[PDB]
Design a protein around this nucleic acid. Structure first.
Ligand SMILES: Nc1nc2c(ncn2[C@H]2C[C@H](O)[C@@H](COP(=O)(O)OP(=O)(O)OP(=O)(O)O)O2)c(=O)[nH]1
Ligand SMILES: [Ca+2]
Ligand SMILES: [Ca+2]
Length: 438
DNA sequence: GGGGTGTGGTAG
DNA sequence: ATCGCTACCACACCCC
């Protein structure tokens, strides 16, 4: 047990937090890409015609947690029992569930208690612990197999378990669905062998958005090949509105309001006008959805292909702690803020940069919300407050940065016992070069 | 046209 | 119990 005023709190929280791990894995994969290509010019040009293979482990955490389960879960069966990965027993997030569990309507992000109600009597839920080290080891095998296949010109890391892989097609060569199926099957086979039991599904297309949709269509443990030329009503009819990239719950809600609760992309496709779309959700998002409903990427999504080194280049740096926050006085809040700054500055020095603008964000208990929320140590219902500040000269000096952070906290006026959440941000980063004469 | 701020939303 | 992170685009609204 490590409380928020204990010096070891940040380390222990991060060691336990799957969301932290997802972010740290993603950032390290982006840096590793940038290094390996420091002199290689890996880029797609307008000269190229390319095919996109979008590859993703199926139920990653669940699968790996199963394969590596301790002897205490030896008899559990991935194909027959509903399996989730989670820390706890009641209001604990389900980080991953297998497709058996999904067959009863369980979804990632659900609390265990709710997912327990969704099972008939006699069927028991299996709760496996996280295995973060082996999650990373299986990913290494994933990216190592991808590279040694030598069939891709650009291998883009999306996350620990997910990658967008790009093959350039010579006009000299006739690409066929026979070759593409074979590549998919090779990819799937090799990865199942290299990871010793994990499965990936693959979306294969000539746009990124179609490759993502194809991938959803491909799951579980399969592959799908859908080019712009194969688009059809049967295709669009098989997708929910929030299968579109960029469409989360808030955009979904707005689209359902504007267009009479479409229940598939085909419904939305046949009912929408671009103007009303822009009006409903926003001009740029409206245009991206419009382009996507034709199977076409917008210019914003396309940048990762034509200039991947600037897309994967870290532009800001931050930490967020919105769990376990229970401070009794301002002194303890200030020490926590310093611990956070120290951690962030360690990271900033690794990447040899300075910051010119910083931000403090906090969560504050809503005035009518219980002091102890339903989730043990959760933030509960909160109001958000942020404030930023430009620094005079770019710096990496703890003294300057931590002082401004604690001052930023001061101006937001949040009583320490009402604090439920804190984020610390370095918003603008500035390279440090060999020349540092004033 | 250029800048500024805080807030919202998405995604693994 | 239980580990509700974090990067970055877009937008509303302000200044010149
Ligand atoms: N989407 C989502 N995934 C999470 C979250 N926390 C942990 N994860 C885990 C689930 C996966 O094991 C891993 C990658 O996310 P995915 O989108 O691929 O979901 P998952 O692999 O569990 O199932 P699927 O790919 O649809 O077969 O991250 C979360 O809050 N949201
Ligand atoms: Ca996955
Ligand atoms: Ca996702």
């Amino acid at each position: 047990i490590v409380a928020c005023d204990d010096p070891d709190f940040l380390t222990s929280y991060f060691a336990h937090s799957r969301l932290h791990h997802l972010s740290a894995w993603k950032a390290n994969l982006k840096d590793k890409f940038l290094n390996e290509n420091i002199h290689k010019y890996t880029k797609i040009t307008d000269k190229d015609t390319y095919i996109i293979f979008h590859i993703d482990f199926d139920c990653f955490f669940a699968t790996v947690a199963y394969l590596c389960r301790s002897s205490s879960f030896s008899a559990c069966d991935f194909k027959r029992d509903p399996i989730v990965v989670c820390h706890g027993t009641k209001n604990s997030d389900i980080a991953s569930c297998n497709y058996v569990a999904r067959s009863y309507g369980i979804k990632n992000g659900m609390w265990v208690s709710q997912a327990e109600k969704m099972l008939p009597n006699g069927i028991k839920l299996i709760s496996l612990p996280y295995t973060f080290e082996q999650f990373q080891l299986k990913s290494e095998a994933f990216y190592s197999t991808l590279k040694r296949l030598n069939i891709f010109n650009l291998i883009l890391p999306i996350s620990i378990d997910e990658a967008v892989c790009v093959r350039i097609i010579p006009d000299n060569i006739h690409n066929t669905n026979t070759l593409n199926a074979r590549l998919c099957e090779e990819i799937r086979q090799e990865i199942f062998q290299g990871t010793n039991g994990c499965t990936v599904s693959i979306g294969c297309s000539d746009s990124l958005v179609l490759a993502r949709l194809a991938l959803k269509m491909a799951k579980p443990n399969g592959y799908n090949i859908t080019f712009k030329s194969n688009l059809s009503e049967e295709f669009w009819s098989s997708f929910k509105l929030d299968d579109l990239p960029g469409v989360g719950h808030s955009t979904l809600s707005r689209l359902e309001s504007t267009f009479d609760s479409p229940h598939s992309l085909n419904d939305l496709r046949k009912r929408y006008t671009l103007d009303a779309l822009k009006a409903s959700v926003g001009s740029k998002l409206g245009m991206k959805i419009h382009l996507a409903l034709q199977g076409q990427d917008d210019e914003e999504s396309l940048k990762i292909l034509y200039d991947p080194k600037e897309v994967l280049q870290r532009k800001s740096l931050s930490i967020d702690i919105n769990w376990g926050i229970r401070f009794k006085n301002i002194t303890q809040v200030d020490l926590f803020i310093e611990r956070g700054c120290q951690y962030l500055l360690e990271k900033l020095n690794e990447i040899n940069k300075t910051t010119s603008q910083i931000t403090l964000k906090l969560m504050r208990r809503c005035k009518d919300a219980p002091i102890e929320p339903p989730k043990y140590m959760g933030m509960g219902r909160c109001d958000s407050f942020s404030r930023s500040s430009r620094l005079g000269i770019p710096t990496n000096e703890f003294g300057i940065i931590a002082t401004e952070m604690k001052s930023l906290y001061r101006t937001l006026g949040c009583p320490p016992m009402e604090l439920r959440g804190l984020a610390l941000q370095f918003n603008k980063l500035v390279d440090v070069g060999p020349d540092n004469n004033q």
